[PDB]
């Protein structure tokens, strides 16, 4: 490749931690989901 | 490669390094690159410099067998050694003695810099769609929370959360679950990131970009089916071109369109490109890099990445078995042995056109490349009609 | 003596009574001035200016009464072969210093080696170098209007793509408020504004929504890059660059890159090897006044002029219409005329030493260097 | 003005059709303005002293 | 040479080969136009 | 910078070569190779600007 220029733009594993961080936020949404369910109960 | 001048009448004679070259036989004023080359050459070479303007032609040819030019001169032997920039050539070799290249050369045609640039339209392409797939997974898990907090409707409501996901602006009826709203935060700050991210890689691909977007060349068959296009793409040089005959060896369709490819004058033709009177022009290749360096305005970009056809060069050839032959060969030896030949680029070759990045012309009203996105859209319309039926 | 040069000194013609216009500074300093002595263009005049004032500070330190002159001709001195006896002689104001036509001198020039051959002055009152007038090209770079960096075909095409595709999914969910859903449901899809009309429930046609969506957010980006490059990048290169710059090194009619006729810096172009022919063509079109250099400069007459690197600075200070060249050359400076052995000499030098020692230097910067907020 | 500023205004759009046309006015408008603030913004980022 | 007045007072001196000055030297340090770019006359519009 | 200055070869007051070597400064800068003095010395790899 001639890639010596700046191609660098993309995020897959790069922003994975962002997106996956969101995913862990979601599973957390399960835990505190049932939690706050109990809280309201 | 060479500079003609007229001595100042107030002067009537040369100054600086100007060396006389007559024109018939009233003297003319002499200068230029190879002029300087041989200048430094004869220094240690110890051969007293004598030169003039060529009478006719440039280099030479076989008319019947006859050379109309400097080849015609050493054929006539009207000179001891070769003045003028050699076209490194096999037939030239067949003629008589030749030199080692002072400046390497090649075979090429020279474009202007295309206003028609701006490249593949990475628009969607930067997306890193493996991650974007992970976002499809995010749609799934979104639904997972949907049915989750529960224990069309929630189903299409997912498509709403996908509305958030895509540019937000989803009109439809958010669900009233509080934890659901927390998920809305998930996809919310999420696609915020994703949003400005697509922005990022986007205007990145704008900023950081590879312009290029030009024709490969006679190495390419599009150049080999030019009449097959609506306009022809003018490619070539003027008559009696040395490398042109190299095309007479090389490409048939070259010789074919050559009539249309007929052109008058080198820098003249350069002006023709400046007027767009032609697509592009073959010419003395390495020169074409250089006089490419010479620019009326700074616009054009000579065709080719710099990888050129048919490597070549220039030197002082001679009649076969000349006297100085191997010596002057050594003159080449120590000659390049200078390293001041860098300064030969200076006094001549080093250009003001600079080089390398032309990068961003791509500021545009953005047709075409935008219409690709339009294509992805219409495609969605197609899949839509499919499922509709 | 000297010649009026804003960087050197700002001295206007005298007043009716020779009344000195009362001038405080931006520092409020009641800027000093003296009486000029100069040409009709033989007239007395009003002496004022930065460097001149520095001289005033000189006599201020080493006590000597002040007396002013100006330069008869323009130049300082120029070795010149005449028609009579053809004896090349440094000829100019410095010439009158040989004539001693004044008791001292000051001006904006470094000592040539040639100058030295005649006589000498002390170490530099200031430092500068050789560079050339750079005329700023039109900055411009404004475009796109509102949407203009989007094709009429593009924005249009997209628009009827919206209205059209609207009709599409509309009748789609229709035959099996779509007519009404065109205006809004299509619109706030396009503007993505969220008027809140509604959306149909067709499982696929909603995804077609997502199509209009990425269509939009795309278009958003289209704006994004649009303004990106729009504000971004720049015009091509500024040329300038090296003293060897091929733009200069390649004589042509493109534009005239030059300096003053009969200049001092001409020395740097006078006795030379490499510079030869270019300096010749320069000698052709060279022009007289540095004032006139600002003139033709603004006039877009020639490619370039050249004056003191300092002079350059003060010029850019004057007008924003031009640019700075790349960097210095032949760099020395300028000072007050001194002739051979002088009583005032060594002590005067010592003075200047006390000048750089002092901050009164920077005070002069106020007089000029700081005197520009440019 | 909610439209104007980052859109995202929750409140009860009026039902006038011509009003909606005005919503287009401020709409594409603050779209431009939006990405514009973006422009000069990350400009001042990129081009900077 | 350090070009200096006291130095001068000492004895003979030269003309500078390389000009000089007086300064201190930082390392490269590791206004927030954020709203400022807005062209708030237009924003007023 | 503060306090412009420079460097040269000073000497005892009233030296013999004094004005001569002064001229040595004259032609010295008269070289222009002093650019190459930056080369052999002053020209830096830190670049600038």
From Swiss-Prot, chain C:
It comes from Rattus norvegicus (Rat). The chain holds residues 401 to 798 of 938 of the full protein. It comes from the Eukaryota. Residues 224-374 are extracellular. A hydrophobic region that gives rise to the prediction of a transmembrane span does not cross the membrane, but is part of a discontinuously helical region that dips into the membrane and is probably part of the pore and of the selectivity filter. Residues 179-200 are annotated as: Pore-forming. NMDA is probably regulated by C-terminal phosphorylation of an isoform of NR1 by PKC. Its phosphorylated state is influenced by the formation of the NMDAR-PPP2CB complex and the NMDAR channel activity. Glycine binds at residues 108, 110, 115, 264, 308. It is found in: Cell membrane; Postsynaptic cell membrane; Synaptic cell membrane; Postsynaptic density membrane. Residues 179-200 dip into the membrane without crossing it. Glycans are attached at residues 40, 63, 83, 250, 347. This is Glutamate receptor ionotropic, NMDA 1. Component of N-methyl-D-aspartate (NMDA) receptors (NMDARs) that function as heterotetrameric, ligand-gated cation channels with high calcium permeability and voltage-dependent block by Mg(2+). NMDARs participate in synaptic plasticity for learning and memory formation by contributing to the long-term potentiation (LTP). Channel activation requires binding of the neurotransmitter L-glutamate to the GluN2 subunit, glycine or D-serine binding to the GluN1 subunit, plus membrane depolarization to eliminate channel inhibition by Mg(2+). Disulfide bonds join 20-46, 36-47, 320-374.
From Swiss-Prot, chain E:
Glycans are attached at residue 30. The extracellular N-terminal domain (ATD/NTD) endows NMDARs with a unique capacity for allosteric modulation, harboring several binding sites for small molecule ligands that act as subunit-specific allosteric modulators of ion channel activity. Phosphorylated on tyrosine residues. Belongs to the glutamate-gated ion channel (TC 1.A.10.1) family. NR2B/GRIN2B subfamily. This is Glutamate receptor ionotropic, NMDA 2B. Component of N-methyl-D-aspartate (NMDA) receptors (NMDARs) that function as heterotetrameric, ligand-gated cation channels with high calcium permeability and voltage-dependent block by Mg(2+). Participates in synaptic plasticity for learning and memory formation by contributing to the long-term depression (LTD) of hippocampus membrane currents. Channel activation requires binding of the neurotransmitter L-glutamate to the GluN2 subunit, glycine or D-serine binding to the GluN1 subunit, plus membrane depolarization to eliminate channel inhibition by Mg(2+). The gene is Grin2b. L-glutamate binds at residues 2, 7. Expressed in the hippocampus including the dentate gyrus (at protein level). Detected in adult olfactory bulb, brain cortex, hippocampus, striatum, thalamus, superior colliculus, with much lower levels in inferior colliculus, midbrain and cerebellum. Heterotetramer. Forms heterotetrameric channels composed of two GluN1/zeta subunits (GRIN1), and two identical GluN2/epsilon subunits (GRIN2A, GRIN2B, GRIN2C or GRIN2D) or GluN3 subunits (GRIN3A or GRIN3B) (in vitro). Can also form heterotetrameric channels that contain at least two GluN1 subunits and at least two different GluN2 subunits (or a combination of one GluN2 and one GluN3 subunits) (in vitro). In vivo, the subunit composition may depend on the expression levels of the different subunits. Found in a complex with GRIN1, GRIN3A and PPP2CB. Found in a complex with GRIN1 and GRIN3B.
């Amino acid at each position: 490749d001639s890639r010596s220029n700046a191609p660098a733009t993309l995020t897959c594993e790069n922003m994975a931690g962002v997106f996956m961080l969101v995913a862990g936020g979601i599973v957390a949404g399960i835990f505190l989901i049932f939690i706050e369910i109990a809280y309201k109960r | 490669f060479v500079i003609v001048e007229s001595v100042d009448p107030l002067s009537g004679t040369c100054m600086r390094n100007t060396v006389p070259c007559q024109k018939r036989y009233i003297k003319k004023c002499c200068k230029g690159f190879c002029i300087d080359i041989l200048k430094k050459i004869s220094k240690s070479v110890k051969f007293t410099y004598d030169l003039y303007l060529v009478t006719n032609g440039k280099h030479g040819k076989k008319i019947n067998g006859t050379w109309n030019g400097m080849i015609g001169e050493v054929v006539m032997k009207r000179a001891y050694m070769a003045v003028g920039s050699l076209t490194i050539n096999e037939e030239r070799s067949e003629v008589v003695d030749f030199s080692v290249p002072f400046i390497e050369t090649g075979i090429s045609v020279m474009v202007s810099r295309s206003n028609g640039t701006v490249s593949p339209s990475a628009f969607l392409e930067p997306f890193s769609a493996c991650v974007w797939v992970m976002m499809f997974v995010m749609l799934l898990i979104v639904s997972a929370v949907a049915v989750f907090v529960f224990e069309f409707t929630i189903g299409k409501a997912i498509w709403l959360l996908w509305g958030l996901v895509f540019n937000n602006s989803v009109p439809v009826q958010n669900p009233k679950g509080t934890t659901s709203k927390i998920m809305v935060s998930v996809w919310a700050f999420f696609a915020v990131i994703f949003l400005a991210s697509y922005t990022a890689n986007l205007a990145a691909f704008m900023i950081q970009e590879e312009y290029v977007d030009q024709v490969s060349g006679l190495s390419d068959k599009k150049f080999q089916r030019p009449n097959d296009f609506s306009p022809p793409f003018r490619f070539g040089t003027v008559p009696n071109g040395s490398t042109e005959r190299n095309i007479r060896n090389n490409y048939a369709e070259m010789h074919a369109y050559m009539g249309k490819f007929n052109q008058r004058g080198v820098d003249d033709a350069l002006l023709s490109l400046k007027t767009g009177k032609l697509d592009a022009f073959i010419y003395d290749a390495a020169v074409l890099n250089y006089m490419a360096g010479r620019d009326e305005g700074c616009k054009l970009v000579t065709i080719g990445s710099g990888k050129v056809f048919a490597s070549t060069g220039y030197g002082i050839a001679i009649q076969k078995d000349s006297g100085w032959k191997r010596q002057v060969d050594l003159a080449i030896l120590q000659l390049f042995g200078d390293g001041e030949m860098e300064e030969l680029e200076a006094l001549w070759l080093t250009g003001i056109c600079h080089n390398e990045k032309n990068e961003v012309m791509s500021s545009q009203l953005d047709i075409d490349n935008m219409a690709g996105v339009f294509y992805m859209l219409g495609a969605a319309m197609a899949l839509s009609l499919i499922t509709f039926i | 003596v000297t010649i009026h040069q804003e960087p050197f000194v700002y001295v206007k013609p005298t007043m009716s009574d020779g009344t000195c216009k009362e001038e405080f500074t931006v520092n409020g300093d009641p800027v000093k001035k003296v009486i000029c002595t100069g040409p009709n263009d033989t007239v007395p005049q009003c002496c004022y200016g930065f460097c001149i004032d520095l001289l005033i500070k000189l006599a201020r330190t080493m006590q000597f009464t002040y007396e002013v002159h100006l330069v008869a001709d323009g130049k300082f001195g120029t070795q010149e072969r005449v028609q009579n006896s053809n004896k090349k002689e440094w000829n100019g104001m410095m010439g009158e210093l040989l004539s001693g036509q004044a008791d001292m001198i000051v001006a904006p020039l470094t000592i040539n080696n040639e100058r030295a051959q005649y006589i000498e002055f002390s170490k530099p009152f200031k430092y500068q170098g050789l560079t050339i007038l750079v005329k700023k090209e039109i900055p411009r770079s404004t475009l796109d209007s509102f949407m203009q960096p989007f094709q009429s075909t593009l924005w249009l095409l997209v628009g009827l793509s919206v209205h059209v595709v609207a009709v599409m999914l509309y009748l789609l969910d229709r035959f099996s408020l779509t007519l009404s859903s065109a205006m809004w449901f299509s619109w706030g899809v396009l503007l993505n504004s969220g008027i809140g009309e509604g959306a149909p429930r067709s499982f696929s046609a909603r995804i077609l929504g997502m199509v209009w969506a990425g269509f939009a957010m795309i278009i958003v980006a289209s704006y994004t890059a649009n303004l990106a490059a729009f504000l971004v990048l720049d015009r091509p290169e500024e040329r300038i660059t090296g003293i060897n710059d091929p733009r200069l090194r390649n004589p042509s009619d493109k534009f005239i890159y030059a300096t003053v006729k009969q200049s001092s810096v001409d020395i740097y172009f006078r006795r030379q090897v490499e510079l030869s022919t270019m300096y010749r063509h320069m000698e052709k079109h060279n022009y007289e006044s540095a004032a006139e250099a600002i003139q033709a400069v603004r006039d877009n007459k020639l490619h370039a002029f050249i004056w003191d690197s300092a002079v350059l600075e003060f010029e850019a200070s004057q007008k924003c219409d031009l640019v700075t060249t790349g960097e210095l050359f032949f760099r020395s400076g300028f000072g007050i005329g001194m002739r051979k052995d002088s009583p005032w000499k060594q002590q005067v030098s010592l003075s200047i030493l006390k000048s750089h020692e002092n901050g009164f230097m920077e005070d002069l910067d106020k007089t000029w260097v700081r005197y520009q907020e440019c």
